[PDB]
Paper text:
The genome-organizing protein p6 of Bacillus subtilis bacteriophage φ29 plays an essential role in viral development by activating the initiation of DNA replication and participating in the early-to-late transcriptional switch. These activities require the formation of a nucleoprotein complex in which the DNA adopts a right-handed superhelix wrapping around a multimeric p6 scaffold, restraining positive supercoiling and compacting the viral genome. In this work, we have shown that protein p6 showcases a remarkable evolutionary design that encompasses a folded core as its foundation, upon which, two structural regions play crucial roles in dimerization and oligomerization.
In a first attempt, we removed the final 31 residues (encompassing the α2 together with the C-terminal disordered acidic tail) with the aim of generating a minimal truncated protein fragment suitable for crystallization. After purifying the resulting variant, denoted as p6CΔ31, we efficiently obtained well-diffracting crystals that permitted its structural determination at ∼1.6 Å resolution (experimental electron density is shown in Supplementary Figure S2E). A comparison between the experimental p6CΔ31 structure and the AF2 prediction revealed nearly identical backbone structures, with a rmsd of only 0.664 Å across 53 pruned atom pairs. The central feature of this fold comprises the β1 strand interacting in an antiparallel orientation with the adjacent β2 and β4 at one side, and with β3 on the other. Furthermore, a 12 residues-long α-helix (α1) bridges β3 and β4 strands and packs against β1, β3 and β4. This spatial arrangement builds up a compact and well-ordered core facilitated by the burial of numerous hydrophobic residues (V13, V15, L30, F35, L39, M41, A44, M48, Y52, V57, V59 and V62). In the crystallographic structure of p6CΔ31, residues 1–8 and 68–72, which would extend β1 and β4 strands, respectively, are not visible despite their inclusion in the construct's sequence. This likely results from the absence of stabilizing interactions provided by the α2 within this region when the protein is in a dimeric state (see next section). Further deletion involving the α2 helix (p6CΔ31) completely abolished dimerization (not shown).
Numbering used by the authors: 8 to 67
Write the structure that this text describes.
């Protein structure tokens, strides 16, 4: 496992309706657990309603 892609989404208010917007994926070196990824994304998008969708480790 040499890298981990974290896929992230945001709940957004558009024309008065709650929708979900895809945010840029971020690929980290090494293995990142889902707990680690959730923590990292909560610090990155301070105060905004973001949620980790998935993590994808790649072996090589």
């Amino acid at each position: 496992i040499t890298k981990t892609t974290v896929n992230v989404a945001k709940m957004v208010m558009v024309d008065g309706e709650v929708q979900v917007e895809q945010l840029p994926s971020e690929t980290f070196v090494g293995n990142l657990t889902m707990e680690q990824a959730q923590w990292r994304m909560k610090r990155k998008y301070k105060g905004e309603p973001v949620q980790v969708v998935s993590v994808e480790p790649n072996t090589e």
